[PDB]
Structure 1
Amino acid sequence: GADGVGNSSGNWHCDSTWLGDRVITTSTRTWALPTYNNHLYKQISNGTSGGSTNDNTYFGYSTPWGYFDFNRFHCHFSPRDWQRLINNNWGFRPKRLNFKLFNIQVKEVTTNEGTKTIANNLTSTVQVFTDSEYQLPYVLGSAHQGCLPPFPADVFMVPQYGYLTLNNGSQALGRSSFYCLEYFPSQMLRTGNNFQFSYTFEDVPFHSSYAHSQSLDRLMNPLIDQYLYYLVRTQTTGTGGTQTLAFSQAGPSSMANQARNWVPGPCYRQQRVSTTTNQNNNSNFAWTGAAKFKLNGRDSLMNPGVAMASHKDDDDRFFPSSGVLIFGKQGAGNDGVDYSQVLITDEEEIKATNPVATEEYGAVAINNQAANTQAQTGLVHNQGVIPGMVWQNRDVYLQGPIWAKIPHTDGNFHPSPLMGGFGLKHPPPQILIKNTPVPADPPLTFNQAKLNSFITQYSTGQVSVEIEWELQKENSKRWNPEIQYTSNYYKSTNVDFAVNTEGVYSEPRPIGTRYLTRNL
């Protein structure tokens, strides 16, 4: 038969294939969908009143719908695969994908007298649809939990969909928009029924898997001397102290002086903090210290900020308070976890072209030099883009994000997601799922009221995401061995990126993308 209950409505594909440039990832996981909001759209707001501050106010709605998110690299990549990709390519980018939902099973749970039994409702349905026109608030790219699990074996719960609208305090404005998912043409399923579609990534720039092997400043030959001169002295050396103009040709020895065609990238000052406890000043400056941007009278934290080097050499302990991504160690607590639990990423690789996060961009003269007045200079903590700058985008990690929807705005600049990734105008459409409400027996005499009693049930099934990535091979003529991600030989009680003695896959550290080195 075509579609029956005693028939697999799809298969399990979890494979990675490398041919030439194209690497194909395929993942399958087993999901479970709870009933959300008792089949109800609820208005949710957080007020100014009460303990909560004004910066955490919001207005929105929580829907009875769940959504499928695969926006995390680890979903499509095995740790071993991530290794192959990082260690041999100068870049890569998504090309197309394929989604599938199958072997859907709906169960109805009954409880009597502390006795609980779960069996099948076959006639029951499950609704699915894609926001192919992008008419629904984009949830994804907010780094929200609920993406497919990293380990294929694990079975996961489907995230609940909800959105935010313009708000003043705990109130909404005239502008704020209320969306109803049901007002969307969605496809329905019964077990033996399957859903699926395909999408093709708009053209996007290859991510850089290469870390520079020349600093922006050191772009010139040591042996030669520039044909240009610079002002070397305003005053005669020694006792005389009489103003004079002396000019010198910037040479190899005087490298700093010599003129350059390109200058470092932009910077927003980030407060510095040291892993060692003692060094830090004894105040709770987590918030007061941190850089932030104020929008509509509300100050939001600048996380994770513009792309900047985490630390200057040998300052490894240092990190921006808010200027890097942080990943919890497995089993880590959501609130107030200790330092040991967290994995603080490090973006030092990009130090060569990008400004250090914790230091000034540089200095600019504050006044005209005078016969009486002395020259002055001021520091640059906040530096915007100017002609001649070059820079590197923030890195993605095996457990990082992949893409993000570029806001539909009149304009924007270098729209590469600040958390790292590919910026798409038309990203993979949001996939929405929901269990169709099955009413409990209605009262015998007609009632104008809307039914408030339903059979309790949840659904389960497999999901498949297959993505085709385009690689960009290395062309380096570097004579010496390059740096590469490896797993240390030395013995240990547990294996890296494996299950422990209890059956708990764990990702020991974040894994960057740039190991291979390319010239500037």
Structure 2
Amino acid sequence: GVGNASGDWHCDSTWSEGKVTTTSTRTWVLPTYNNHLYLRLGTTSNSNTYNGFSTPWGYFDFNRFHCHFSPRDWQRLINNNWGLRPKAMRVKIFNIQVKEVTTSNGETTVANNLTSTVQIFADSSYELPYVMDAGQEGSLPPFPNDVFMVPQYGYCGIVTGENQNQTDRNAFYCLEYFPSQMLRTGNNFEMAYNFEKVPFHSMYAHSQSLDRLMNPLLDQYLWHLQSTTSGETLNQGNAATTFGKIRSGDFAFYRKNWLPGPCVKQQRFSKTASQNYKIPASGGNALLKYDTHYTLNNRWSNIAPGPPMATAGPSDGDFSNAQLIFPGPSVTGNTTTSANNLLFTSEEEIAATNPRDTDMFGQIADNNQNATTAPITGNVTAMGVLPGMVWQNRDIYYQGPIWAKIPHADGHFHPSPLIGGFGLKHPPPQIFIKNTPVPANPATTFTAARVDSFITQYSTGQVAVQIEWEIEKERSKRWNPEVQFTSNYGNQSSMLWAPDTTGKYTEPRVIGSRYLTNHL
């Protein structure tokens, strides 16, 4: 009925010995996009050209972690458990209120239209292109008491060449072609979903460095050739070759059982403006050209933080493109001069297992040495996976995405979003929503032309998302106290992680999940 609420606002976290369940609700506003029509989209810009469509529909996105975890909760989670992975989810939209706007002259009036319908469907079948997954605004806001605007749905189409235009292959997906539920106030929508078994994300830092796992005290039983000649001078000395049983201490020489990492090199820049070479953002030598990129169908796509690699700590004066950058509290606009106002994610913790972003993978003999010809070593920058390699994935972040859909392709290797998160073949479905059109008074004599005059409307209501996370406690045997993340903030005039006098809420730092320790 019109008079009855169709759902209660509950946001909660319930913790278990084995599983924690998060639940949060938010209020949303839904405009009328593109005055009700699908629009072709395309621009051709050389290293950017793209093509696609913009839709009258909007969608709900809960892909950021902070959507379901209050800071404290995130804390609880990461200081206590080694791994976590999502198990099941369920969503419900309710208290739909459709508003109609009179828009008188000078003043715009708004009043409820009780008999109006907003339509929601979610598609399981994954027939619509998935977009919820990468790098984008629209997720519910972290702070509960913040109303948000449902994002408009638009999708990309395959672009052939450096020039944007469409081939027969390009396709059009029309949301109205799908069956969807129609609601009015007093109507509600609900759906459930079960995640697929997925590797627990590792929420620990290695307490051992891969290269040396051996017993410091003993020495291998293998021998290596130590020197072709005597002395410490490169090209002089007595001819004889000498072999020696690998002894305790010459660890760098120990034959090991594993190779540390897959790797792609990244350019490095210094946070101090002064240190960098001059590089423009446009023109023949715009930065893009010098930053590690992957050429695809004639178009440079700059590699996103790439195959997981070690990166300078957050405080460090140098930073690489490999690390993710978050706004930070103080920044006002879209652009800023000093990087002291930004937040940098860093994977120092990964260093124990795999190569550094700005440094190389290693160096290989790139030549066959000989008495008359000197040995030459080649610098290796790109290294595909090799038998016996072991690496760590990029960590997840409080404000980082949670899942991402694994491309529907013949081949994929070690799916783990590179931006961080769990790779799913069938990820939480995008739930679409749109305000049904309505018509302005219409002409008395019939005209075939499609109607174009519509009443102005917008809707609002609350959505509630609940996720059941499966986690695993630590159970370590380490004796010395671990590192844990605790605020440690100095005396503050207006406390952190809280709304302020203005009433504004902003997240102070970016937070990872690897504080606990574990050995290899």
- Is the TM-score greater than 0.5? yes
- The answer (yes or no) to whether the contact 1:310–1:318 under 8 Å persists in 2 is no
Deviation at 1:275, TM superposition (A): 1.7
Structure 1 residue 244: deviation in Å?
A: 2.2
CA distance in 1, matches of 2:314, 2:110: 59
- 1:208-243 CA-partner distances (Å, limit 9, x unpaired): 100000111121111111111111111133797233
CA distance in 1 between counterparts of 2:39 and 2:275 reads 48
Query: Which residue number corresponds to residue 292 of structure 1?
Result: 293
Partner AA of 1:491 in structure 2: N
Three-state SS of the structure 2 residue aligned to 1:278 is helix
Shift of residue 394 of structure 1? 0.4
Residue 334 of structure 1 and its aligned partner are, at CA, apart by: 5.5
Q: CA deviation at 1:331?
A: 6.4
| Aligned mate of 1:185, from 157, 179, 182 | 179
| Deviations 1:56-111, CA, capped at 9 Å, x for gaps | 11110000000000000000000000000000000000000110000000000111
Query: What residue is the counterpart of 1:141 in the other structure?
Result: 133
SS in 2 for 1:12: coil
2:220 corresponds to 1:223: no
After superposition, the Cα gap between the structure-2 partners of 1:489 and 1:373, relative to the gap in structure 1 and judged at 3 Å, is closer
Matching of residue 328 in structure 1 with residue 327 in structure 2: yes
- The aligned counterpart of 2:12 is 15
Cα shift at 1:129? 0.5
Q: Which residue of 1 aligns with 2:437?
A: 437
Moved more, 325-334 or 152-161: 325-334
Which residue number corresponds to residue 424 of structure 1? 424
CA distance in 2, matches of 1:192, 1:96: 27
CA RMSD, 1 decimal: 1.5
Letter in 1 for 2:63: N
1:264 aligns with 2:263: no
2:176 alignment partner, SS class: helix
From the superposition, tell whether residues 238 and 451 of structure 1 become closer, same or farther in structure 2 (CA, over 3 Å): closer
Q: CA deviation at 1:514?
A: 0.1
SS at structure 2 position matched to 1:6: coil
Equivalenced residue count is 510
State yes or no: 1:309 paired with 2:301: no
C-alpha displacement of 1:37: 0.5
Indicate the larger mover: 189-198 or 212-221.
212-221
Partners of 2:98 and 2:458 within 8 A in 1:
yes
Structure-1 separation of matches of 2:468 and 2:353: 31
Looking at structure 2, the residues matched to 503 and 468 of structure 1 have their Cα atoms a distance apart, in angstroms, of: 32
Distance in 1 (CA, whole Å) between partners of 2:455 and 2:244 is: 87
Shift of 1:491: 1.0
> Contact 2:294–2:300 (CA<8 Å) still a contact in 1?
yes
**Shift in Å, 1:16:** 0.3
**Which residue does the alignment assign to 1:408?**
408
Partner Cα separation in structure 2 for residue 273 and residue 489 of structure 1: 29
Shift of 1:489: 5.4
Contact 2:314–2:345, Cα closer than 8 Å, also in 1: no
Query: 1:98–1:467: 8 Å Cα contact kept in structure 2?
Result: yes
| Structure 1, unpaired ranges of 5+ | 48-52
TM-score by length of 2: 0.96
State the match for 2:446 in structure 1. Answer: 446
Amino acid at match of 2:21: I
Aligned to 1:318: 318
1:391 counterpart residue number: 391
**SS class of match (2:25):** strand
The two structures have a TM-score, normalised by structure 1, of: 0.96
- Listed one character per residue, the Cα deviations across residues 321-367 of structure 1 (whole Å, up to 9, x for unaligned) are x2111111246356332323321111111110010000011111112
Q: How does 1:50-61 map to 2 (within 5 A)?
A: 53-61=45-53
Residue 83 of structure 1 corresponds to which residue in structure 2? 75
Give the structure 2 partner of residue 50 of structure 1: none
The answer to whether the Cα contact below 8 Å between 1:92 and 1:206 also exists between their aligned partners in 2 is yes
Does the 8 Å contact 1:92/1:471 carry over to 2?
yes
Residue matched to 1:158: 150
TM-superposed deviation, 1:382: 0.9
The equivalent position to 1:25 in structure 2, one of 22, 27, 39, is 22
Name the CA distance, whole Å, in 2 between partners of 1:174 and 1:145.
Answer: 31
How far off is 1:315 after superposition? 8.4
The 1-side partners of 2:12 and 2:346 are apart by: 30
Deviation at 1:167, TM superposition (A): 2.3
Q: Indicate the percent of aligned positions where both proteins have the same amino acid.
A: 61
Query: Structure 2: how far apart are the matches of 1:353 and 1:273?
Result: 24
**Code of the aligned partner of 1:249:** K
2:111 paired residue number: 119
DSSP-derived class of the 1:111 partner: coil
* CA distance, structure 1, for counterparts of residue 107 and residue 273 of structure 2: 53
The worse-fitting range, judged by mean Cα deviation, of 239-248 and 433-442 is 239-248
Give, in angstroms, the shift of residue 253 of structure 1: 1.7
Hey, what does 2:283 align to over in structure 1? none
Instruction: Supply the AA of the counterpart residue of 1:124.
Output: S
Contact 1:361/1:383, CA 8 A, preserved across alignment: yes
Q: Give the whole-Å Cα distance in 2 for the aligned partners of 1:187 and 1:63.
A: 18
Counterpart residue type for residue 519 of structure 1 = H
CA distance in 2, matches of 1:78, 1:453: 45
Q: Which ranges in structure 2 are unaligned for 5 or more consecutive residues?
A: 281-285
Displacement after TM superposition at 1:370 (Å): 1.9
**Change beyond 3 A, Cα 1:445–1:489:** closer
Deviations 1:412-468 (A, max 9, x none): 110100000000000000100000001111110010000100000000000000000
Q: Deviations over 1:22-67 (max 9, x none)?
A: 10000000000010000000001002xxxxx312111100000000
1:280 is aligned to 276
Alpha carbons 1:369, 1:375 under 8 Å: kept: yes
Deviation at 1:314, TM superposition (A): 11
